[PDB]
């Protein structure tokens, strides 16, 4: 249902 968040900034 929800994506794996790969954001790190």
């Amino acid at each position, epitope marked *: 249902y*929800k*994506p*794996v968040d*790969l*954001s*790190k*900034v």
Partner: antibody, heavy 122, light 114 residues
Framework: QVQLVESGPEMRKPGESLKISCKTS????????TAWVRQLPGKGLQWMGI????????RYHPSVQGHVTMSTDSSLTTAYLQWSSLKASDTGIYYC???????????????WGQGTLVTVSS | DIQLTQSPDSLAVSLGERATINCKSS????????????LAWYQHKSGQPPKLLFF???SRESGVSDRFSGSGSGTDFTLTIDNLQAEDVALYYC?????????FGQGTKLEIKR
């Protein structure tokens, strides 16, 4: 000028170690992950995993987990793909690519290395 | 683990005609939070690194010809190439990045009929 340049083609015997490199330039290293992708003979691409230089966070494809290692040198803005002991079946072309690590960005691979042919043979 | 299946596997299309590649996901890659599909299309020409054509399923990459269009949602996606040109000969790949691993479809080989 965004660029990812990989080391040249390499040849090793089975069981030997090998580390190949992906030198990045023209962008902030810490704003992206580096991905490694294997090109299969005939047709196909295998997403092998990604590594973030800011904290060494790695995500490996389950089928390469434990056989390869990723590392980075942020000072050299370079990512590395490692094998501690190669198999003859590790032979193939390996690509590196960049993946946006900024918030709300997608994780498509928008810039790629030229590919490097690793050969493992006796 | 989300897998992608492309159809057809191979394709021979005449110059100036339209080519169509389908991509189907084993799980939806649509996020209602985003209103985005976590999918991309790539073009892989011989002797070249793969090239990104579309991301978020339908956002055209800067510099990609207007002849290319990406559509679809959830599990069902399509790459279309209108008015086929000689330089379109390549393997084409879809990829999801909804969760890890970010798998590619098996690839579709596009041949030009002249």
């Amino acid at each position: 000028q965004v660029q990812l340049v990989e080391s040249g083609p390499e040849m090793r015997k089975p069981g030997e170690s090998l580390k190949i490199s992906c030198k990045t330039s023209g962008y902030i290293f810490s704003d992206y992950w580096t991905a490694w992708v294997r090109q299969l003979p005939g047709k196909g691409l295998q997403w092998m995993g990604i590594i973030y230089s800011g904290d060494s966070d790695t995500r490996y494809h389950p089928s390469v987990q434990g056989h390869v290692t990723m590392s980075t040198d942020s000072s050299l803005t370079t990512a590395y793909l490692q094998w501690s002991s190669l198999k003859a079946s590790d032979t193939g072309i390996y690509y590196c690519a960049r993946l946006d690590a900024r918030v709300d960005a997608g994780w498509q691979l928008d810039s790629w290395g030229q590919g490097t042919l690793v050969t493992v043979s006796s | 683990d989300i897998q992608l299946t492309q159809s057809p596997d191979s394709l021979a299309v005449s110059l100036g005609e339209r080519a169509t590649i389908n991509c189907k996901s084993s799980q939806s890659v649509f996020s209602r939070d985003n209103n985005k599909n976590y999918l991309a299309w790539y073009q892989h020409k011989s002797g070249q690194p793969p090239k990104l054509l579309f991301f978020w399923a339908s956002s055209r990459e800067s510099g990609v010809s207007d002849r290319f269009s990406g559509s679809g949602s959830g599990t069902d996606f399509t790459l279309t190439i209108d008015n086929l040109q000689a330089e379109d000969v390549a393997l084409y790949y879809c990829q999801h990045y909804f969760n890890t691993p970010h798998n590619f479809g098996q690839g579709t080989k596009l041949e030009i009929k002249r």
